[PDB]
Design a protein around this ligand. Structure first.
Ligand SMILES: O=C(O)c1cc(F)c(Cl)cc1Cl
Ligand SMILES: [Mg+2]
Ligand SMILES: [Mg+2]
Ligand SMILES: [Mg+2]
Length: 716
């Protein structure tokens, strides 16, 4: 082979080289000592890693048997709850505590606003996301359906003044709602000046300042004739750009060219569910991008620099031009043959990710010629989101892993902070303890609701048929799950200390709907929530101007809005819930969902994209959509809702539709009609028919295998 031997490990040459030639230089870490650390950490932590996975299996078998061993139709909750306690699934709740995590940037502790997640393997998207800290409100309004395309404001191949004027009006209104004038409206402004460190806004008949002069943060250009005016509200910046000479400015009553919102305050560069990375070459491509981001020299076109302003008084000052970056590592389950041992066994991927993404992150703490010019964390922290954990022992293990990595890296202990995903049932019902296990490292918790639903289905697979996928988002268990997560964070002292986050808006083209409905998230006390794009970050930023999250959080303090019984309410369908046409509809829906995603993943190594659903609505989901759909169909198969012929026929009907939906794609290769020849189609089928047998319903073992199979076929 072409592997490098280091103790018990045999490292893929492409990885070894990348680390030696690209990652290590500038860190001052001894290369032979680094690799020695890797071998040691992998040797030391692998058994515990394996033990935790086996414990998941042990637990699930007992739940399976408990369900199968009874006939009693409605679930006896008292008995169910004491059973879960007995087997160590439901652990005792620790006493009240407050997190002690320190050295955390203000973007995480304090500022509430949109959080962007992007696939790290896409250099363009990662670059765009990093730059999405600031975004044009006008572009976001003009370019989406937030402004209706009425029989008067329809987007053409060129600028529509009717549409533009509506964009302007909408933004003027946002200004009045967010930074009110002491009298009158921004809609009647005729100019801006800075007089005696005070913002002066010219009306037709008077001048006025702001109701709160403190919202005035600064300006650019001459105070007599500002080029722009900087404002602030709920910790987020708003910039009014002034340019009468501009295409839009000339039509504007105050010469305003645009309104810029501070949008994506933080971004998560994702190595997990939004990417397809099944071997060393794929991991390296991701590691190299994360490196470029942390050095500040990634280009594909370049990262933005910080923003220069003049304080109201006259001093200069500067603001971050880039989103503060987290990285999301893979979780505890998978191995990757990037490194194998002597036996040829693959090394745990989560362990590797912590070592390599952690090493790379050192560059984001420095600014030089070898380290690149750009800084990520000014406070000295590295932010790692850790997905798919099941319970406090698994959280503890990640923290011990980070400690071991810190030692290998020569970093202070607790440099490596943890963003805890609450997306598995055993974490949900033990959340307070999971937080305690990371009490000196935790910088967020977040409800990963799609993975969570997949776990919900798989955990109770033997209980009975589940409700339909669309119904899941309004079931009692998930609404309690959402409220419980906020309760736990706040009680652990997250306000002012750590983010409380909610899930991804997936309908990329439904921006009107997003602006209308996603406001529920900060209203529920989430200091952040996920958006899929810079445009969506800008629009979701509107919500944080309308909702005072800090005040909302203050008011939820001390309240306990979900019981353990509510969390434990399994989403079983009532008897005779569905007509046969509705059953067929749900099957087709889920099969299309699986095919649509699996085809891009297996054939093109794409893990996130705009996939049209069965009704051609554009969704940008990640691998979790596969977990839910495959588990639901497996559940329906298992309890006799549908037959194996039903499933095959739906896959066979949905496949040509998926093909057609991908018609504008040069590299696309159709699944229909030779289904046994399509690795993609068979992967889809395998996810379903083997669904009930996958550990906690996880799709990676099958997906990875099938993607590796596709790459191997392609290589000849
Ligand atoms: O929920 C997630 O983990 C997620 C992450 C992503 F990066 C994207 Cl594009 C979509 C989702 Cl649904
Ligand atoms: Mg740097
Ligand atoms: Mg997830
Ligand atoms: Mg307010």
């Amino acid at each position: 082979t072409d592997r490098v031997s280091v103790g018990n490990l045999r490292i893929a040459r492409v990885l070894y080289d990348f680390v030696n030639n690209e990652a290590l230089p500038g860190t001052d870490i001894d290369p032979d000592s680094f690799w020695a650390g890797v071998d040691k950490v992998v040797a030391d932590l692998t058994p515990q890693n394996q033990a935790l996975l086996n414990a998941r299996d042990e637990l699930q078998a007992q739940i399976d048997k408990w369900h199968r061993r009874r006939v009693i139709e409605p679930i006896d909750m008292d008995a169910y709850r004491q059973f879960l306690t007995e087997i160590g699934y439901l652990l005792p709740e620790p006493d009240d505590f407050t997190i002690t995590t320190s050295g955390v940037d203000a973007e995480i502790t304090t500022t509430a606003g949109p959080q962007l997640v992007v696939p790290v393997l896409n250099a363009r998207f990662a670059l765009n996301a990093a730059n999405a800290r600031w975004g044009s409100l006008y572009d976001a309004l003009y370019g989406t359906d937030v402004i209706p395309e009425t029989d008067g404001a329809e987007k053409g191949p060129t600028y529509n003044k009717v549409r533009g004027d509506k964009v302007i009006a909408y933004a003027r209104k946002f200004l009045d709602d967010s930074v009110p004038l002491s009298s009158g409206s921004f809609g009647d402004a005729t100019g801006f000046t800075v007089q005696d460190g005070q913002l002066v806004v010219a009306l037709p008949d008077k001048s006025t300042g702001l109701a709160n002069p403190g919202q005035f943060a600064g300006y650019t250009g001459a105070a007599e004739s500002p080029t722009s005016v900087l404002l602030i509200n709920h910790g987020l910046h708003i910039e009014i750009l002034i340019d009468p000479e501009s295409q839009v400015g000339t039509t504007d009553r105050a010469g305003v060219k645009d309104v810029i919102l501070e949008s994506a305050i933080t971004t998560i560069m994702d190595f997990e569910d939004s990417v397809a990375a099944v071997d060393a070459a794929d991991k390296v491509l991701g590691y190299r991008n994360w490196l470029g981001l942390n050095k500040g020299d990634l280009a594909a076109r370049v990262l933005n620099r910080d923003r220069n302003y003049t304080a109201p008084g006259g001093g200069q000052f500067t603001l971050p031009g880039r989103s503060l970056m987290f990285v999301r590592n893979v979780g505890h389950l998978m191995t990757n043959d990037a490194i194998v041992d002597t036996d040829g066994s693959e090394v745990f991927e989560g362990i590797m990710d912590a070592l390599f993404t952690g090493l790379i992150a050192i560059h984001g703490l420095k600014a030089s010629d070898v380290n690149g010019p750009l800084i990520n964390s000014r406070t000295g922290s590295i932010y790692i989101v850790k997905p798919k954990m099941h319970g406090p022992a698994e959280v503890a293990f990640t923290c011990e892993l980070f400690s071991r990595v810190e030692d290998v890296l020569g970093l202070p202990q607790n440099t490596m902070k943890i963003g805890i995903m609450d997306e598995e049932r055993r974490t949900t019902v033990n959340l307070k303890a999971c937080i305690k296990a990371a009490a000196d490292r935790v910088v967020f918790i977040n409800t990963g609701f799609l993975d969570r639903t997949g776990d919900e289905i798989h955990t109770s697979m033997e209980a009975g048929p589940m409700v339909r996928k669309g119904t899941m988002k309004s079931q009692p268990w998930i609404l309690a799950y959402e409220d419980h997560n906020v309760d736990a964070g706040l009680a652990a002292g997250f306000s002012g200390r750590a983010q409380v986050g909610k899930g991804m808006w997936t309908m990329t083209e439904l921006m009107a709907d997003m602006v209308e409905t996603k406001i529920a998230q900060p209203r529920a006390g989430a200091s952040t929530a996920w958006v899929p794009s810079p445009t969506a970050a800008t629009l979701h930023a509107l919500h944080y101007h309308q909702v005072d999250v800090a005040a909302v959080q203050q008011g939820l303090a001390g309240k306990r809005r979900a019981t353990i019984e509510q969390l434990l309410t399994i989403p079983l369908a009532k008897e005779l819930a569905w007509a046969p046409d509705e059953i067929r509809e749900e099957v087709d829906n889920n099969c299309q969902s699986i095919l649509g995603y699996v085809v891009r993943w297996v054939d093109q190594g794409v893990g996130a994209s705009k996939v049209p659903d069965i009704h051609d609505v554009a969704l940008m989901e990640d691998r979790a959509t596969l977990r839910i759909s495959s588990q639901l169909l497996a559940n329906w198969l298992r309890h006799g809702v549908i037959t194996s012929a039903d499933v095959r026929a739906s896959l066979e009907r949905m496949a040509p539709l998926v093909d057609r939906q991908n018609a504008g794609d040069v590299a696309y290769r159709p699944m229909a009609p030779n289904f046994d020849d399509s690795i993609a189609f068979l992967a889809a089928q395998e996810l379903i028919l083997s669904g009930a047998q996958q550990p906690n319903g996880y799709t990676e073992p099958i997906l990875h295998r099938r993607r590796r199979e596709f790459k191997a076929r392609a290589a000849e």
